[PDB]
Design a protein around this motif. Structure first.
Motif, mmCIF file in Angstrom:
data_model
loop_
_atom_site.group_PDB
_atom_site.id
_atom_site.type_symbol
_atom_site.label_atom_id
_atom_site.label_comp_id
_atom_site.label_asym_id
_atom_site.label_seq_id
_atom_site.Cartn_x
_atom_site.Cartn_y
_atom_site.Cartn_z
ATOM 1 N N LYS A 30 0.782 -1.217 0.000
ATOM 2 C CA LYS A 30 0.000 0.000 0.000
ATOM 3 C C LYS A 30 0.825 1.285 0.000
ATOM 4 C CE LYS A 30 -0.777 -0.030 5.033
ATOM 5 N NZ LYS A 30 -1.835 -0.470 5.990
ATOM 6 N N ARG B 263 -3.565 4.264 -0.402
ATOM 7 C CA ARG B 263 -4.669 3.422 -0.216
ATOM 8 C C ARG B 263 -4.524 2.705 1.094
ATOM 9 N NH1 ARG B 263 -3.242 -2.171 -0.984
ATOM 10 N NH2 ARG B 263 -1.260 -2.496 -2.178
ATOM 11 N N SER C 93 -10.230 4.444 -2.106
ATOM 12 C CA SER C 93 -9.000 4.697 -2.853
ATOM 13 C C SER C 93 -9.114 4.417 -4.389
ATOM 14 C CB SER C 93 -7.881 3.848 -2.255
ATOM 15 O OG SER C 93 -8.130 2.434 -2.302
ATOM 16 N N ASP D 139 -11.578 -0.042 -1.249
ATOM 17 C CA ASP D 139 -10.290 0.173 -0.672
ATOM 18 C C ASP D 139 -9.768 -1.192 -0.317
ATOM 19 O OD1 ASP D 139 -8.007 1.660 0.148
ATOM 20 O OD2 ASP D 139 -8.905 2.342 2.034
ATOM 21 N N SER E 230 -5.997 -3.019 1.567
ATOM 22 C CA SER E 230 -4.801 -2.772 2.285
ATOM 23 C C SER E 230 -3.680 -3.719 1.992
ATOM 24 C CB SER E 230 -5.108 -2.824 3.798
ATOM 25 O OG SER E 230 -5.992 -1.757 4.090
ATOM 26 N N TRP F 18 -5.534 -3.358 -8.896
ATOM 27 C CA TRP F 18 -5.943 -1.977 -8.569
ATOM 28 C C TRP F 18 -6.295 -1.374 -9.963
ATOM 29 C CZ3 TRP F 18 -2.517 1.957 -5.484
ATOM 30 C CH2 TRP F 18 -3.367 3.002 -5.026
ATOM 31 N N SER G 194 -7.669 4.390 -9.698
ATOM 32 C CA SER G 194 -7.436 5.256 -8.505
ATOM 33 C C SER G 194 -8.293 6.499 -8.596
ATOM 34 C CB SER G 194 -5.951 5.633 -8.306
ATOM 35 O OG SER G 194 -5.489 6.323 -9.482
#
Ligand SMILES: [Ir+3]
Ligand SMILES: [Ir+3]
Ligand SMILES: [O-]
Length: 148
Positions: free
Chosen positions: A7, A31, A59, A72, A74, A144, A147
């Motif tokens: 992250k 994030r 995020s 989001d 982690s 991901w 963003s």
């Protein structure tokens, strides 16, 4: 194999790569305030980044096979589609367009969710076209996708 990132954006193995400039993932970017799972009916807004939404902090948009969507996350994530875990497939009936992802090959792909629940990518650039489904998830970690 394609590396995962923590992250803070540090590569967890291998060498780091940058994302395509036209990817919906824009780095660097924080994030990881919370792991927040969401439904496909409930995917986060541009609007939601700084506020969060009722579901929690945002995020952007993360996805892995299942499909499982997050706003989001982690733990370790991909910044590029791990194409060694994808296989050629015919285009599916798309239920949702979810973003523009960098491939582990460095190219830009549109990413879609199919009615069969598969995550599918299709080359964005003209020429050298491919259609691929996310079939293996050996590190059980999401990409991901965007963003905020
Ligand atoms: Ir749509
Ligand atoms: Ir698009
Ligand atoms: O946002």
């Amino acid at each position: 194999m394609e590396p995962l990132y923590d992250k803070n954006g540090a590569v967890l193995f291998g060498e780091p790569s940058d994302t395509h400039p036209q990817s919906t993932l824009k780095l660097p970017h924080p994030r990881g305030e919370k792991e927040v799972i969401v439904g496909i009916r409930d995917l986060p807004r541009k609007g939601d980044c700084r506020t969060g939404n009722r579901l929690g902090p945002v995020s952007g948009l993360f996805v892995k096979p299942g499909p499982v969507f997050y706003q989001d996350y982690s733990g370790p994530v991909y910044h590029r589609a791990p194409l060694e875990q994808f296989k050629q497939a015919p285009m599916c009936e798309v239920t949702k367009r979810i973003g523009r992802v960098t491939g582990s090959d460095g190219n830009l792909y549109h990413m879609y969710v199919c009615t069969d629940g598969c995550i599918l990518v299709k080359t964005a650039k003209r020429e050298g076209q491919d259609v691929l489904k996310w079939v293996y998830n050996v590190l059980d970690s999401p990409i991901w996708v965007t963003s905020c």
